[PDB]
Design a protein around this ligand. Structure first.
Ligand SMILES: [Ca+2]
Ligand SMILES: [Ca+2]
Ligand SMILES: [Ca+2]
Ligand SMILES: [Ca+2]
Length: 291
DNA sequence: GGTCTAAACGTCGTATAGGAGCATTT
DNA sequence: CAAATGCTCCTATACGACGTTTAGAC
C-alpha cells in the first residue's frame, strides 16, 4: 500500500489543479464554473492511479489515448482538499493549489452562482497556471489576478515525498560516452536525475542537501536538472534511499535494472569489452527502449 | 603520459501538465 | 429548468532521457 507522502510527492510532479469557466446559456450567470484535480499519465502507469484511488477512496479513472484520474464532484474535491491540507505540496503547485482551494470554497457555499462571486473566481483563475485566455479576459476585461503565494523555504517533508516526486520527474539512466581515451572506447556512468522548471531551482538545491549528493545543472524548457554521477553517492546514498522509499510505476522496473548496472560498474566490468556489451543490452531495455 | 572518474555541456521527443465545453444526471 | 457532474476531445511544453567534451586526479 502506497504512502500518503508518495502521493503528494507524485502530485507535485504530475498533478494539475484546474478551473474551467465556460459559457452556458442555460445557467443564470451565463457561465459554468468548475474546479478540477487531475493526474494524467501514459496508459502503462494506470496502476499508479489505481493505487492512488484505493488510498483516497475517491477519483474517476479513465484510459484511452492516455490514463487519467480526475476529481470534479464536490465530494471528490473534498477528499483532495483534505489530503493536500494534511500532506501539503512543496513545489510551486502549492500556489496553484491555494488558488484552487479558494475557488472550491466559493463554489461549495454557492457564491459562484452570483455575479460578484463569479467575478471573484476569475481573479483566482487569472493567477492559476496559464491564467485567463484572451477570450476570458475580453468577457471579464477588468479582472485583476488574485494574490499568488510565492512558495519559499520549503523543507523536504518526508522521504516518501522524494520517492513520489522522483517517480514522476526523476530519471534513472545509464550514460555511455564515446571516448577514445578509454580501453573499451566508452565511459560508462550510472546517472540519477530529476528535472524541473527553473521556477523551483531552490527546491532542487534543497533536494541536493537532503540527499547529500548531486549537482545542479542549468541547461542552454529553461529547465534545471539535479544530477548524481558520483559512484559512491549512488552506492551509499541514492540506492539505499530508494530501497526504503519505493519507486512506483514502470520506472520501478527501470530503477531495478539501473541498480543492477551499478553493481556491474562497481565491479569494473564496464572497463571490459564483454561487460560493456552486457551493460549496453540492459541499457537498451530500459526507459524508452522498454517495450 | 595513459586510464579512468566526475561532471560540465549538448539536445531530441513526448508524456506530462494544462486546457475547454457538450452531454447527462440530479 | 438550473445546477451538478459525467464524459470527451484539444494543445504543447516541462519534462525524461539520451550523447559528447572537458577538468582532473591517479
Ligand atoms: Ca513535474
Ligand atoms: Ca513522469
Ligand atoms: Ca513529469
Ligand atoms: Ca516526454
Amino acid at each position: 500500500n502506497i504512502s500518503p507522502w508518495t502521493i503528494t510527492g507524485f502530485a507535485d510532479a504530475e498533478s494539475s489543479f484546474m478551473l474551467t469557466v465556460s459559457k452556458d446559456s442555460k445557467r443564470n450567470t451565463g457561465w459554468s464554473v468548475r474546479p478540477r484535480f487531475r493526474i494524467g499519465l501514459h496508459n502503462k502507469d494506470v496502476t499508479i492511479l489505481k493505487s492512488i484511488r484505493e488510498y483516497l477512496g475517491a477519483g474517476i479513472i479513465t484510459s484511452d489515448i492516455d490514463a487519467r484520474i480526475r476529481f470534479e464532484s464536490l465530494k471528490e474535491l473534498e477528499v483532495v482538499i483534505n489530503h493536500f491540507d494534511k500532506y501539503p505540496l512543496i513545489t510551486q503547485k502549492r500556489a496553484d493549489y491555494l488558488l484552487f482551494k479558494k475557488a472550491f470554497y466559493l463554489i461549495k457555499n454557492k457564491e459562484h452562482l452570483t455575479e460578484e462571486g463569479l467575478n471573484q473566481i476569475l481573479t483566482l483563475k487569472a493567477s492559476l497556471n496559464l491564467g485567463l485566455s484572451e477570450e476570458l479576459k475580453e468577457a471579464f476585461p477588468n479582472t485583476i489576478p488574485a494574490e499568488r503565494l510565492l512558495v519559499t523555504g520549503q523543507e523536504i517533508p518526508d522521504s516518501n515525498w522524494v520517492a513520489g516526486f522522483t517517480a514522476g520527474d526523476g530519471s534513472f539512466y545509464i550514460r555511455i560516452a564515446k571516448n577514445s581515451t578509454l580501453k573499451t572506447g566508452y565511459q560508462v556512468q550510472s546517472v540519477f536525475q530529476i528535472t524541473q522548471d527553473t521556477r523551483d531551482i531552490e527546491l532542487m538545491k534543497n533536494l541536493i542537501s537532503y540527499l547529500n549528493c548531486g549537482n545542479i545543472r542549468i541547461r542552454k524548457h529553461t529547465c534545471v536538472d539535479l544530477v548524481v554521477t558520483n559512484l559512491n553517492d549512488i552506492k551509499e546514498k541514492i540506492i539505499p534511499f530508494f530501497n526504503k522509499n519505493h519507486i512506483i510505476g514502470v520506472k520501478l522496473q527501470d530503477y531495478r535494472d539501473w541498480c543492477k548496472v551499478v553493481t556491474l560498474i562497481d565491479n569494473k566490468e564496464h572497463l571490459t569489452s564483454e561487460g560493456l556489451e552486457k551493460i549496453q543490452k540492459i541499457k537498451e531495455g530500459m526507459n524508452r527502449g522498454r517495450s
